[PDB]
Symmetry: D2
Subunit: 248 residues, 4 copies
């Protein structure tokens, strides 16, 4: 596999996109730290990856706490000796409300996880990668890092910020054997989204020129590509996996 001998960290890897990323990375021979705030989801993920022949180990962390993220990376190096690859994926949707109605605490919660937690990841990841000869970071953005999601101004702002942070890191670290890029998924099938009224699901689908929602594995293939040597001249970029959503 293309990540043989590499150590990879994934945040929010207990479900959806993060899990699919943890699976891809393990399937290509990485030793994967599965991180999540939820221990049940985290352990199930490690057992499923072990079951299918991979090396994974679970480390609990809330990305909005910088001490827990520093401790995650520290533990990664304890369990596996190094850090080569990180996907900063943990995120929340947040309250839905018009910006003028948007809660103060709800705003801060979304920004602390979706932005600050990504920044904390990057910071301790970069610190480690400089000790072990470099590495590659993938930041999970969204189509909402470039276009609005009405009623989700916090999410949008946080995802835009992630894009900007990615550009900064890719530029700053270009000659330091570190790459950093962002991925921008549109709407992706998860159990939550199957709950919607058929007409609401069809309204969302009609925003994607491909005429369906994405699958977590389709995001994960892009993440894998940007985390491997195949993307060796790619850095500071934002990469859509959007079904055409932003083309119109």
């Amino acid at each position: 596999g293309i990540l043989d001998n590499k150590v990879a960290l994934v945040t929010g890897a207990g479900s959806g996109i993060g899990l699919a990323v943890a699976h891809s990375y393990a399937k290509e021979g990485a030793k994967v730290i599965v991180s999540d705030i939820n221990e049940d989801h985290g352990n199930k993920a490690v057992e499923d990856i072990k079951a299918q022949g991979g090396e994974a180990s679970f480390v609990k962390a809330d990305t909005s706490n910088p001490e827990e993220v520093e401790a995650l990376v520290k533990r990664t190096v304890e369990i596996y000796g190094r850090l080569d690859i990180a996907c900063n994926n943990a995120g929340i949707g947040g309250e839905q409300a018009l910006a003028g109605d948007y809660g103060l605490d709800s705003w801060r919660k979304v920004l602390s996880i979706n932005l600050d937690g990504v920044f904390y990841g990057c910071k301790y990841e970069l610190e480690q990668m400089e000790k072990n000869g470099g590495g590659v970071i993938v930041n999970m953005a969204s189509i909402h890092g470039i276009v609005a999601a009405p009623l989700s101004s916090a999410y949008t702002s946080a995802k835009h910020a992630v894009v900007g942070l990615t550009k900064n890191i890719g530029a700053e670290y270009g000659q330091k054997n570190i790459r950093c890029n962002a991925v921008g998924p549109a709407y992706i099938e998860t159990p939550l989204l199957e709950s919607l009224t058929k007409e609401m699901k069809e309204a969302l689908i009609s925003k994607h020129p491909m005429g369906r929602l994405g699958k977590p594995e389709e995001v994960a293939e892009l993440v894998l590509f940007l985390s491997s040597e195949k993307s060796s001249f790619m850095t500071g970029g934002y990469y859509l996996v959007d079904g055409g959503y932003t083309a119109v």
Copy 2:
């Protein structure tokens, strides 16, 4: 004056861009609340505006504190009866350091002021605007809302987030007689740039195809246009005043 009997609020209005915007608004007949964290600067601006034939009043605020921002909009309505226009301009540059070395506190501070404070302003501005038949908001972003500034990853992130927030507000309030746009200046000549050496100044200048830095008045002109009825079909947009910087 194209803003006759409008009431305008400007944050960080004591110096630089904010001061020029406050002047331009007053020159066009607006009643202006000059807000700044610094009372001497703010009071000085109000006198200068009044000396030139305009109407203005000073209200102290730290935009990172949501209570102070709510109080500012309140006080605007107490003094002039309504809020028609707002320019969310207060910001800081922040620590300059590699993202891996960037301070946790320095990161929070830049994001607090440059993003949360803009959000707080927009939140309380929108709330009032819906009570007085709508209005117009201009958010001060930067070229760094779309391109990196090496060593200023917090600043970049925050300004990207401002561009996102703007798109969201413009999208959400499209049918509510409220417009919201963002301005992206490049580097602007202010007395605070006479602590650059000759070589550091020429280096900044060489990044602008126009071969000079911008003036605060030239940024204010764009703010003015975006705040008036002349820009009636412009909302959610990002508008460069960059001397060519981002064309290459």
Copy 3:
């Protein structure tokens, strides 16, 4: 007016946006060369301009012919002595078809008028402006200079090209007292729209967060801004007048 004694050229100024731009420029004191492929429309526009106190002259030109555009600019200099401002507005929409079905001749025709004609304009405009101390160009793009219009691939491709051209010119001429920017209108009201049933108007309206189409005068207001000294530090940029269309 703000354009007092400037000499301004507008292509395709017999109808819609160009007409509004020609009115705006003339209302603000410019000497306006009205150009169009239709003599009746053109002369009609010049007479209409003069009826409100304006100075204008008609000059026929087909912008797909470089010789005609070069002679258009010679003729402008003959009539008014110089060229200060040019708006390259002349366009067509082309046939509606899937890219795979798109006519070879229709592709050619759209690119020839909407791109080559803009290039011709800029080439011969720049030549003359370097003889007379500089000046300002505005190129008419569209939202479809940055997002797709399904079934109108030629139009989209040409307007994308116009944005790229504009960046090049802004950057190339930044120290030669020449500015060049591009305007991106969304969908605009035309005479025909009033004739349609409710459902046919509302079709486009729903893609604009502002809940209406734009008026040609609202586009001309941004073109005027970008044509005057008010925008003196703006060059190489793309400027939306889109009602929020591209924010989502």
Copy 4:
């Protein structure tokens, strides 16, 4: 092999990026049609591909001639039965001059190859892919599909149009089992660049945060990814391989 039994067309495949794409496609099991205007280069690429163990054939074509492009696709179908993948790569750099000094012929020649040839390619490719249950197209753009290249306005304009064409095709064909994306390389090592002086090469390198030029293989890996089923939820997008160039 990830393209096993797929039929892949590459234009301008005699050298540089196109040659690397053809090698990558063939290595992954595709039956490759190498197209080039130069027979000697084309035949040599086929021999080199066959020598590694791949399947390929040469079809001569000038992409600026739409009949030749039609015939190229017809011939691909005669040789290998179908068309699944196409990479529209043939391009030229064109004359270097200020926009106001740019030759009329040079402009047309650059646009004819860089844009029109890409459209002709997509036209006849889409026409065939609709007969054989779909396919995937990659259009070669450049960093200059989004940022200017002073003295190369025709190139910039044409690559911008490619980006727009791509968005259109991805949007239009989304539910028709056809994907279309564009690739945006920065400066890539070629014999030409290699020769150009130590001082100029350094100046160009220093515009890339990664501190080197790209290799054609590095571009090809992104093309391969975008042509494979791994990118199944990616369409209408623009994908950088720029070493960080556009991040600042």
